[PDB]
């Protein structure tokens, strides 16, 4: 359901291209009219993933980097919602890959946590900083690790994301993988540089927060 108080934002959300075209034909300014959250038709089109509508808006020359009241840009919205083709179009029209919202998150953070593989590759090929830290000092790798997104970790590693960045609690992605008992993800991380010796702010290493026999599994890998 769409919460926008604007008719035009609702048209964009429900994918009514023709009706939207008529509205905007009747009043050009509607293309960039902001609702109660400073979202325009573009934000809402990205959310619902209506590619043709985004394409139309873009060719009208609407701004593509304006943030809503929560700091979310169209790219943030498209990446989170998993809108492959829209992300591609946005990046093609100069969307800022490293834009942050009020939480300090880039579009990559959401791609990574939500397991948007194609979008992640797009963002990273587009120059996204893999080590970008949000206001919790967490990286995309933290998200991928916690959720147990193996493929996403491989992607991030190919683009040279660090495995040992500590968040605000002092946890590395390995701490998170171990706590959620994400076994294969934890092995991968270790096999590619993640330290089993780094302590969080409770002075625990990733082995000490590991559940099941995961601690010993990782200890073996490193220490035999």
């Amino acid at each position: 359901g769409c919460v926008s108080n604007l008719m035009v934002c609702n048209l964009a959300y429900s994918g009514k291209l023709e009706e939207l075209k008529e509205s905007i034909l009747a009043d050009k300014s509607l293309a960039t009219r902001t609702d109660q959250d400073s979202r325009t038709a573009l934000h809402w089109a990205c959310s619902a993933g209506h590619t043709e509508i985004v394409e139309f808006l873009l060719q009208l020359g609407v701004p593509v980097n304006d943030k809503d009241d929560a700091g979310w840009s169209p790219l943030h919205i498209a990446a989170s919602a998993g809108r492959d083709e829209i992300v591609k179009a946005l990046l093609g029209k100069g969307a800022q890959v490293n834009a942050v919202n009020q939480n300090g998150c880039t579009p990559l953070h959401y791609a990574a946590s939500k397991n948007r593989h194609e979008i992640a590759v797009m963002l990273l090929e587009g120059g996204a900083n893999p080590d970008a830290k949000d206001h919790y000092e967490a990286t995309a790798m933290h998200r991928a690790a916690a959720k147990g997104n193996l493929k996403m970790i491989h992607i991030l590693l190919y683009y040279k994301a660090s495995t040992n960045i500590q968040d605000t609690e002092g946890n590395t992605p390995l701490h998170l993988a171990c706590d959620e008992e994400r076994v294969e993800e934890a092995k991968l991380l270790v096999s590619q540089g993640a330290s089993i010796y780094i302590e969080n702010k409770e002075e625990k290493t990733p082995l000490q927060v590991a559940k099941g026999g995961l601690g010993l599994i990782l200890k073996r890998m490193v220490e035999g």
């Epitope: 090929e125 120059g127 491989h154 992607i155 190919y158």
Partner: single-chain antibody
Framework: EVQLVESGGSLVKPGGSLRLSCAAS????????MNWVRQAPGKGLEWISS????????YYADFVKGRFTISRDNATNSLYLQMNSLRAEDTAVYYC??????????WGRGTLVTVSASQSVLTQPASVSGSPGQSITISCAGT?????????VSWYQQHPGKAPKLMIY???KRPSGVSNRFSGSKSGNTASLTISGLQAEDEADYYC??????????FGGGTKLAVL
């Protein structure tokens, strides 16, 4: 339609130095990681080098050791490979390949390099006798360093003189446009491709590739599938 055309493949005396080129079209070249993969006669698919869209990230297989250098020009949609000091073990068909991680989705017809003048790390069966309509399985075996639960095996199909096709990647996932008669799985240090209801068009060569990291792609020696 996506097209990759390799050129520059010739015969050259050992010690010589070649330069391969690839003309790309049918997609946004600049947005894609590109690769060079070579295949010696009878041998498997050996990944050589990859380069990111922006040229920021470049990787080489261990054997390269400075002898090869990949480059690209997004402006003119072309990929290059500078090969120095050509040994005889370099004799192969060199393919230009689009893809990242384990997903090598587009290959060119390849260009042949001949140097005029020790098995594969992963182990496949040489031959597989199939009977139309039945069901067969090709195995890909390695050590615990080669095939694991936290990395991927991919399967590639190849007909005589044709661009290799990606059948399976990520152990078990298959690209759109590929028949569901093809499936893959893995147990311990061994991956298995399976085909059900064999065709005669299914008769071909099959190769496995274990993706370990950005600079490590292990390969099997190939498996000839004969459809009776």
């Amino acid at each position: 339609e996506v097209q990759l055309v390799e050129s520059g493949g010739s015969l050259v005396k050992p010690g010589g130095s070649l330069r391969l080129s690839c003309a790309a079209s049918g997609f946004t070249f600049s947005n894609y990681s590109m690769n060079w993969v070579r295949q010696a006669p009878g041998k498997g698919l050996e990944w050589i080098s990859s380069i990111s869209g922006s040229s920021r990230y470049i990787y080489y297989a261990d054997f390269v050791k400075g002898r090869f250098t990949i480059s690209r020009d997004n402006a003119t949609n072309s990929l290059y490979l500078q090969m120095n000091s050509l040994r005889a073990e370099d004799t192969a068909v060199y393919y230009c390949v689009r893809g990242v991680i384990d997903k090598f989705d587009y290959w060119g017809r390849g260009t042949l390099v001949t140097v005029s003048a020790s098995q594969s790390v992963l182990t496949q069966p040489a031959s597989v006798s199939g009977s139309p309509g039945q069901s067969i399985t090709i195995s890909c075996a390695g050590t615990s360093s080669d095939v694991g639960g936290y990395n991927y095996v991919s399967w590639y199909q190849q007909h005589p003189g044709k661009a290799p096709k990606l059948m399976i990647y990520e152990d078990s996932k298959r690209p759109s446009g590929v028949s569901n008669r093809f499936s893959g799985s893995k147990s311990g240090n061994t991956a298995s491709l399976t085909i059900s209801g064999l065709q005669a068009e299914d008769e071909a060569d099959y190769y496995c590739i274990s993706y370990i990291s950005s600079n490590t792609r292990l390969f099997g020696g190939g498996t000839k599938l004969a459809v009776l």
